[PDB]
Design a protein around this ligand. Sequence first.
Ligand SMILES: Nc1nc2c(ncn2[C@@H]2O[C@H](COP(=O)(O)OP(=O)(O)CP(=O)(O)O)[C@@H](O)[C@H]2O)c(=O)[nH]1
Ligand SMILES: Nc1nc2c(ncn2[C@@H]2O[C@H](COP(=O)(O)OP(=O)(O)CP(=O)(O)O)[C@@H](O)[C@H]2O)c(=O)[nH]1
Ligand SMILES: O=C(O)N1CCNCC1
Ligand SMILES: O=C(O)N1CCNCC1
Ligand SMILES: [Mg+2]
Ligand SMILES: [Mg+2]
Lengths: 265, 290
Amino acid sequence: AIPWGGNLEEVLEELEMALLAADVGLSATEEILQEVRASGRKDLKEAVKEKLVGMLEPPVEPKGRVVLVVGVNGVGKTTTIAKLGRYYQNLGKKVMFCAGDTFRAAGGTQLSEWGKRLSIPVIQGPEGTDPAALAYDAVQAMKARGYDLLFVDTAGRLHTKHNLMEELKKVKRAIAKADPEEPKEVWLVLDAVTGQNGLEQAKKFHEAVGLTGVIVTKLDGTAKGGVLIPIVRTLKVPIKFVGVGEGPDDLQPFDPEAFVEALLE
Amino acid sequence: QLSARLQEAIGRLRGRGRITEEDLKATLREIRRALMDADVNLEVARDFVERVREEALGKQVLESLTPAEVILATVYEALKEALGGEARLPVLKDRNLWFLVGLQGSGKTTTAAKLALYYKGKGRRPLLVAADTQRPAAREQLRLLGEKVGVPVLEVMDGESPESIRRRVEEKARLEARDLILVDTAGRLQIDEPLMGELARLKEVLGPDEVLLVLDAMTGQEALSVARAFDEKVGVTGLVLTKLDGDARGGAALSARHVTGKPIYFAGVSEKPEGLEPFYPERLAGRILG
Ligand SMILES: Nc1nc2c(ncn2[C@@H]2O[C@H](COP(=O)(O)OP(=O)(O)CP(=O)(O)O)[C@@H](O)[C@H]2O)c(=O)[nH]1
Ligand SMILES: Nc1nc2c(ncn2[C@@H]2O[C@H](COP(=O)(O)OP(=O)(O)CP(=O)(O)O)[C@@H](O)[C@H]2O)c(=O)[nH]1
Ligand SMILES: O=C(O)N1CCNCC1
Ligand SMILES: O=C(O)N1CCNCC1
Ligand SMILES: [Mg+2]
Ligand SMILES: [Mg+2]
């Protein structure tokens, strides 16, 4: 634990260890420490909290009707969509999903099972069907049927695979072909246990389709999700929600004060 | 082909004459920091550079006319050795039963099917066991992979006891002469005591000769605590490092091997069932440092 109250030199050394252990990374850690050393303040605990909470601000209301959910393989996209449906249906929205993962075994089935459990409709197609054509169809159903929110699942993909990032651009363009305002939200899903590669993921998804938000999953684990700090600093993309389990209720709006408190514990 | 920070750290010694211990200290600090930027856990990175320091001193680095090259070679050789030195695969017996375990999303189900395909091509007769009954469509996922690779899949029923799993697995394996049994388990947190207890009980009953911690290459600092807990609470015999077709440096592999002392057997290099090859410590050492 960081000895708040003790001498400055030992506070900064345990703060450095705490930030690095949290996956905050070398650059952002050094920036945090340099500012605090040039702070000159007796309540270092409150001054540190304030610097970190300021780094993380560049009910959650989507900016429009369509939310494209993106991220690398395994991070929590499909489950996060399920949770988002529960969150918004609890607020009285008419929600639907598009099972845009037509690539991986049981991708569609997994989302379809969530839809049944949640009483949320899922637009699906046969395996191998073009996800762009499917998303276009789902947006036209959303419009015709008067749905408030459509969440578009995407297959897991690595950000190093140019062809897969292009497919993702095609899905976004197909959404905009159906409704030129949309999608007004493009949300990256980031697994909390991820190290410095998280920043590279964010940069490359942002370059491809323009992120408007990040959701950090698996924060019920021991990982702090600290790579969010360099992500928000670099890209100025806000953190929208945190995932905190595997059930439909295990999603919380992002709370920067609590996030930072947990990061330093 | 080094990372910028290592290039700067090593490079600034070149052509400057013999070094002092102060120069060695400053260089090792930058090496430590580079390892952390490559997702080596901070404690493991410290232990590593302490080892390098004593090796470099013992090689008379302070009298070397090419200290930049001696330090670099010492780091590379030490990292290669710390990752296992050379490729090594699991020892096959007449009957093999392996668990795939790890965190949510790490690649376990895919890896079970990859191992089935790999060993089918080397004369084994695998059996896949879909023991994840909590994730929606988990058993269907493995069933579909099994069909793709031409390997049967025994699916565990909701609520089924470990003893019932053993009975059914033993009977199918005996009847069909299956000699490599690959048990795909649900993703779980290392601090989820009930689920870690469940996994330990399954090991006790099924008696696997390998328990493979499937670790995502992008895993950060928590790799140390994760691998330690899986090792202490269940018992890990080796690792599979997945998603190395990404650009994550893979420092978590060092964290995991440091705390368990266990081999990293295999690398995942594609989503496809064919995307498995032996882990090459030499290659990952170069990626971590590059
Ligand atoms: N503990 C925990 N597990 C989570 C959380 N969010 C998702 N998961 C889990 O992680 C695993 C992967 O989730 P999934 O929704 O399939 O991820 P995905 O990104 O769609 C996988 P793909 O890229 O293959 O489509 C699942 O086991 C799931 O239950 C969370 O907040 N906490
Ligand atoms: N590119 C790439 N993708 C991989 C590799 N290994 C697994 N994946 C992918 O990562 C995602 C997660 O794989 P999966 O096998 O479901 O992981 P899991 O650990 O069983 C998920 P859970 O914990 O819920 O059981 C899938 O999209 C899959 O195709 C790999 O080596 N390379
Ligand atoms: O299959 C087994 O149970 N064996 C035979 C080969 N050596 C170890 C035990
Ligand atoms: O086989 C290995 O160990 N690899 C494969 C892909 N890159 C890193 C190491
Ligand atoms: Mg998915
Ligand atoms: Mg699985």
